[PDB]
Symmetry: D2
Subunit: 228 residues, 4 copies
């Protein structure tokens, strides 16, 4: 039996401003930084040691990862950063005020974009100044894996290969894994690991700043799930 | 070799091709004919000056051995080699090990054509506790069991081939590496579908002959400039 | 930038530097001054347009945190990061955790100077069963025990730094990658000795300032074209 | 099996052995006899139930091909394979490509004994611009030029073999991997000296037969429990 630990990053500066973020590379707020430190201290007090840490390539998640590791006396743990763990891309909604958006397109269309499993947002123009295609951190990837907008379903389709190639093999080799990522990428992993239906997954809550522990059997089936 | 070039090679005849048995993920060896095809392909790559910086292959022996022979015969057995289940042949389900002629007799030509190549229909599945299930092969011991297939068609094969293109092959090309991919009919057809932007309808007619090096000349964005067989 | 550049950053003051203690492999934290030094360096590199493709650091927290601060303050925390024991500070043996002044009072000024600055004089060795021996730190649990030292001089530090230059740092530069190395006084001094071609007799006089980015312009043979501090 | 086992295999006869030519880093092929020795060793490993999780070899074709044959004849060609210059044969300098009798004529009979029986005496070095210099070989193009030697003795061979033990082989064993190492007389001898703790005075007399699997049973600390030829 192996334990697998997830941590979702806390508040960003754009959450505080009520802005859609997606793949925009925004900084944690002071509150979000404290949440990361509190989470690392909790893992330390319960004696959680890690052999490898997986994160996204977005600064708010990487910094959360580093804070959690440092506050639990294991900043030496190897770290792999991957676009496959990025937040869901929000298309042309990125950078927009959620209130101003609901007032422009209506409360109902906004609810769809945020709460529908397989409804894509309005897509971002491929050569927009704030398109991910212009971001150097994706330069080594074929351009067509850089999305112009995602929902949770498409987010899952690109998270899952990283579970299959890196996370699950690490667990099966005996490694104690930390995953430090985002609301929707962690929600995608949880849907797969726990076998949650399409109908139920959009309602699954993953709190920010609270370590989530899975206990898995030799076939990676969930035996225990609890928040630290 | 003025442009960035990518080379594919499909392995030659296997012992089960000669016996007319469905193979799929069963780990059968090359026939002498298939061994000769690999050597002739390596000599052709040598004669035309094809140097590689990395080689990708499946974890099925017939493809790995093809890869090794091609490298040796072109004087570059030192080239680093990555083996991945994601480049395996399609899984043939319960049909693995059966005679193709007897299967066509029992079920009819058209049903056999659908099992051979479909974008929407799976072969009959192989029971997970069968003695020859891939779940029992230690080369997949570090994969979740739900990743190890019980049967696949071309669409499902593509869906597990593509992440390897996204994570390993395409980054290698974009980094400037001259890539060799030595694999199987269906996994190479899956890559070609994505590389060439072929529709779900049209990929059903894409044929890739055994033992003939296939060269793509790609531009800076990995679009096909030219495609030809050596 | 017009040429291929290699950047070194030595971490700033630690909480043990302020208190005049030998540190070695003890995993001490940066002081407030050391943290500010790392931010100022990242700002400098940001202002001068230094982008990195890969970052190398030790497994000691003060160096990793320096590396992370520098990347964050130059808008590139996404850069891949490899941590290795081979970039650790020189192990100071039994002197680790001792006060340098009280050590000089006990053994004399010259002996502490020899321990600090002799190229090939080992410090007194730390017993392998000591609670603060590196053999008990789980970050070295995946290494054979006989590579975990009980004490080091600069000569043996170079002997274990150099393979990491040969296997990882130099191949990265040669592949075209813009490299950051965030480490310690003795491990960077070791790299400098090799890169610059400094004699055994001259290296103990080489100073590497803390928290100041050091830039090597290199040619295609990794020979120093120019060395300057940012 | 019972404990953690590590298997070495020295490649069999090369085409230069019957000509009595010093080989070193020259990339010579296995003879038909050498090919048979590899197949028989793989057959022996299969019969005795030796499964591998990872295989390490040099970047010289005769060792890589031995490694591939051993894996294939034991039904495990899928095993991941890492090729490294650090497992190359000892570089023989200016003696490479020369007859052992013709060497006695140009240097004298006693001087040849020293070059083949002294732990720490270098052979005459090969000029870096020689037609048959390793510096011209593209398999080392991704490495700093000074790791490619102009000639080596066993001591210098051990100095560049040992980091690969420390970085790759021993961490694999310590993680639970069943390791195969397919390499050369002097690089395997270097490994044996370190693993077994053999002195400088005794190691030059250590014989490693060709084509004969060598098995180490190691304990959790990588201490030898038993060493035996299969």
């Amino acid at each position: 039996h192996m334990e697998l630990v997830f941590i979702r990053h806390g508040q960003s500066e754009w959450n505080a401003k009520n802005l859609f973020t997606g793949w925009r590379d925004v900084k944690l707020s002071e509150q979000g930084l404290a949440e990361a430190a509190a989470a690392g201290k909790k893992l330390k007090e319960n004696g959680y040691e890690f052999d490898i840490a997986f994160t996204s390539v977005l600064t708010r998640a990487i910094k959360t990862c580093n804070i959690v590791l440092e506050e639990s006396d294991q900043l030496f743990v190897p770290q792999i950063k991957t676009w496959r763990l990025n937040e869901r891309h929000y298309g042309r909604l990125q950078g927009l005020d959620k209130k101003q958006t609901a007032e422009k397109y209506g409360d109902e269309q906004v609810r769809i974009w945020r709460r529908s499993y397989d409804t894509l947002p309005p897509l971002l123009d491929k050569d927009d100044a704030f398109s991910a295609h212009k971001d150097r951190r994706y330069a080594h990837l074929p351009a067509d894996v850089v999305p112009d907008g995602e929902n949770l379903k498409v987010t899952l389709e690109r998270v899952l290969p990283f579970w299959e190639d890196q996370i699950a093999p690490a667990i099966l080799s005996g490694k104690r894994v930390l995953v430090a990522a985002h609301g929707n990428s962690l929600r995608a992993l949880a849907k797969h690991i726990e076998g949650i239906s399409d109908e139920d997954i959009m309602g699954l809550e993953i709190p920010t700043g609270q370590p989530l522990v899975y206990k898995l059997d030799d076939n990676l089936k969930v035996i225990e799930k609890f928040y630290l």
